[PDB]
């Protein structure tokens, strides 16, 4: 019933789940789990990971 | 009963190792009577003792 967020993987993050990452540059990300977070931290492109929403929409 | 001697003699006759000596498990008693290299020689000819082939170490992957 709060703001409903979307991950690096586009999945819907319900309140009380995942983490939030605020970089020094001023942009803020929210992740669903350490799999999605560490994928983002290793600079992997979600358009090339098949289970990601941005891949499904792309293809 | 025990074929320690026959396996040793069959190795020497076949000029192989004990690794490659095959004493027929069905004819344990027949092999057990062969207490000399001459009886071993006839066992090999008759087929109750077989020299097994070399374990395959192919070089195709290297080639």
């Amino acid at each position: 019933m709060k703001v409903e967020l979307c991950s690096f993987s586009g999945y819907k993050i319900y309140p009380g789940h995942g983490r939030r990452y605020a970089r020094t540059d001023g942009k803020v990300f929210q992740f669903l789990n350490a799999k999605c977070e560490s994928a983002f931290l290793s600079k992997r492109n979600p358009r090339q990971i098949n289970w990601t929403v941005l891949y499904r929409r792309k293809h | 009963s025990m074929l320690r001697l026959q396996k040793r003699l069959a190795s020497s006759v076949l000029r192989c190792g004990k690794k490659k000596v095959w004493l027929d498990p069905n004819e344990t008693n027949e092999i057990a009577n062969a207490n000399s290299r001459q009886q071993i020689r006839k066992l090999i000819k008759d087929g109750l003792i077989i020299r097994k082939p070399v374990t395959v170490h192919s070089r195709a992957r290297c080639r």
Binding site: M1, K2, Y11, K12, I13, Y14, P15, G16, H17, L32, N33, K35 | -
Partner: protein
């Protein structure tokens, strides 16, 4: 010589017999102070720790940083199917304590309850209470029961009811019911005797024992940990890496004098499976359980007035290691002692709730039902289906049978 720098001792001495609990159920050990002005009511209940989840709610604590704000809070689901009253105990106040004056048991004790009297129910011929129940129908037996009820009326101070859980309504492997004495508070001895008498063989739901957002106390046994060293048991400091005999030890277990090891020295032994009571556990909800009128009415288990979604308290894929919650349940706030499917005693508070932390109305907004068997990310089946669309397993299902 004195120790160089002061430091508090490890572990409390108020739990010193740190042994396996002699009981499994968890004894009340103190019922709330009985007063006659209040109406007749029960003081305890038996539930089972179904699992945990988290909720979202709006806080109404003025002067706080969370006032008019949403928070998430861990809550523990405890399944509480209605218990059955099967007996009455009288107690008399002697100058040596309470002593059990007289016990009266109802006719038609259920088979699940009679399992409690047998170490081997399978080989048993189930003869327990078969001659006792015969006295409820003959004249001399009934007249005796009248004399025993009247003797309780004029000689007993506090009376308690024997009540047992209905284990057949639970998904557990156990069929043996849990018996417990529940004190009847609030009235004269005659009044609570007449109340308890009419409840014999009847069912007492948790709605008539506890209420919404009242602080209760949870009594039970904690998780067992087996034999444990001093570092896990008493949380003492580890010795450095260079220690010869080992570092998960206590270096000095006493001075030369008093020439004996003191009882207050941390030592290795059984950890866990201890009988503990925790006070001030707020009730956030009391679910309605499943009910059939024309179909299976399941929505109101986890449907808050802001959710309006047809779902139960059960997570996706069921509660881990417990099963499916179907009966009425009580959603306590925060962690609770014990493993899953561990019997818990829920007791009315011995204190009086006057702080603003207590007597605060709870108004839920959201109840998490994602899968707890992993990193669940969907609340219901239908939400998962709408997000993913049809899959291969459902394609061939719609292809083979058309």
């Amino acid at each position: 010589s004195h120790r160089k720098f002061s430091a508090p001792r490890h572990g409390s001495l108020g739990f010193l017999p740190r042994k396996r609990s002699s009981r499994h159920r968890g004894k009340v050990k103190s019922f709330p102070k009985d007063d006659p002005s209040k109406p007749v009511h029960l003081t305890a209940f038996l539930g089972y720790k179904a699992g945990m989840t988290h909720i979202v709610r709006e806080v109404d604590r003025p002067g706080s940083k969370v006032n008019k704000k949403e928070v998430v809070e861990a809550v523990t689901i405890v399944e509480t199917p209605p218990m059955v009253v099967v007996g009455i105990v009288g107690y008399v106040e002697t100058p040596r304590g309470l002593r059990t004056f007289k016990t009266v048991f109802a006719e038609h004790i259920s088979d699940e309850c009679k399992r409690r009297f047998y170490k081997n129910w399978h080989k048993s011929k189930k003869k327990a209470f078969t001659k006792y129940c015969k006295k409820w129908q003959d004249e001399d037996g009934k007249k005796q029961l009248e004399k025993d009820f009247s003797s309780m009326k004029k000689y007993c101070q506090v009376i308690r009811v024997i009540a047992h859980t209905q284990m057949r309504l639970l998904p557990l492997r156990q069929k043996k019911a849990h018996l417990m004495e529940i004190q009847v508070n609030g009235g004269t001895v005659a009044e609570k005797l007449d109340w308890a008498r009419e409840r014999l063989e009847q069912q007492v739901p948790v709605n008539q024992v506890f209420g919404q957002d009242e602080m209760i106390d949870v009594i039970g046994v904690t998780k067992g940990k087996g034999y444990k060293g001093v570092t896990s048991r008493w949380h003492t400091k580890k010795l450095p890496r260079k220690t010869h005999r080992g570092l998960r030890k206590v270096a000095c277990i006493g001075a030369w004098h008093p020439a004996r090891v003191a009882f207050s020295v941390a030592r290795a032994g059984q950890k866990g499976y201890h009988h503990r009571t925790e006070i001030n556990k707020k009730i956030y909800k009391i679910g309605q359980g499943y009910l059939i009128k024309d179909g299976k009415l399941i929505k109101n288990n986890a449907s808050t007035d802001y959710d309006l979604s047809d779902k139960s308290i059960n997570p996706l894929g069921g509660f881990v290691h417990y099963g499916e919650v179907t009966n009425d349940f009580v959603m306590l706030k925060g962690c609770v002692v014990g493993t899953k499917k561990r019997v818990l005693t829920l007791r009315k508070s011995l204190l009086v709730q006057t702080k603003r932390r207590a007597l605060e109305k709870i108004d839920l907004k959201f109840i998490d039902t994602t899968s707890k068997f992993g990193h669940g990310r969907f609340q219901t089946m239908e939400e998962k289906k709408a997000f993913m669309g049809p899959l291969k397993k459902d394609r061939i299902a719609k292809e083979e049978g058309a």
